[PDB]
């Protein structure tokens with residue numbers, strides 16, 4: 001069967017909580033786990049020397065002080081930069097504001113003292129290997145990224161790199177996914193034991209034609225709305241459940257990262273949310289007594 005139909009309700013920190021902390025940094029992950037997130041959610045790219053690093057965009061421009069495409073830079077180049085240079089609470093990463101906007105700019109580079117409990121390295125772009133070292137016992141939702149939407153070779157390069165590494169850990173508490181369905185198929189071929197979730201065309205095909213997503217799928221990981229169509233409804237999740245799949249919902253501009261939304265998606269029987277505000281979600285769950293993995297409680301439907 002599917003263990004993930006019981007792993008609910010999940011607080012899956014979107015890149016660690018991009019509205020509450022520098023996205024894809026160890027600070028964000030360490031913070032997010034500490035306040036009660038059941039699962040990390042993160043993005044992977046690869047350096048010029050084929051090192052899997054945890055970053056979302058193909059270019060380091062938006063979240064750091066540097067410039068260039070991750071695949072053009074070595075890990076040693078990428079690691080020295082400040083992955084909190086442009087963080088602003090409530091607004092992820094936004095360059096060009098008064099330097100006082102940035103409460104954690106410069107901590108990686110040593111110009112400000114880190115908050116208590118963290119080192120300057122907790123604010124750089126981490127190797128995926130270092131995140132796995134740091135969370136041996138936390139499930140990690142990993143998403144394969146590429147150089148551009150149409151650069152199918154870069155997704156496949158990353159899928160290869162990812163499966164090799166995840167195999168070496170011998171772990172199984174992952175969910176690997178990509179917007180590019182080819183990457184998922186290639187990843188599933190190289191690492192059949194690791195749970196996946198469908199890419200874009202598999203989701204369309206399931207929603208539209210009933211076609212079950214690739215063997216090995218544990219969950220459907222869906223935005224709330226897409227191009228006007230409401231995806232994460234009670235009915236859609238009723239059917240996904242009936243067909244044996246979990247539903248994890250993300251937001252990221254398709255619907256507001258706010259309290260009413262999180263509540264509606266909880267009420268829609270989703271099994272996990274991917275909030276940019278993992279603190280805000282954790283408070284809602286605690287306050288409502290919603291069942292959690294292990295810790296039982298209220299079933300909101």
Ligand SMILES: CCCCCCCCCCCCCCCC(=O)OC[C@@H](O)COP(=O)(O)OCC[N+](C)(C)C
Nearest residue numbers: 015018023056178179200203204207208221226250252
């Ligand atoms: C008629 C057919 C209708 C059927 C529905 C079709 C819907 C299809 C839309 C695409 C859905 C693919 C889901 C699989 C990939 C995934 O998990 O999404 C990425 C998400 O976590 C973050 O979103 P971002 O773009 O990575 O942005 C954040 C960046 N950050 C973290 C720094 C803010």
